[PDB]
Design a binder for these strands. Structure first.
Length: 17
RNA sequence: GCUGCGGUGUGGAAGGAGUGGCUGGGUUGCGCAGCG
């Protein structure tokens, strides 16, 4: 549940770059 | 912010996390979830 709203690059894998 | 999820696509009614991908939809699209 992200309360910041910034929206960081998802970890896990490449996806999020 | 920090991390994770083949999970969802302009294939995900099939992989795998790039540990194939910086043209192939892509300098790893798009969303979602967890923690403050």
């Amino acid at each position: 549940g992200p309360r910041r709203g910034d929206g960081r690059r998802r970890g896990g894998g490449g996806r999020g770059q």
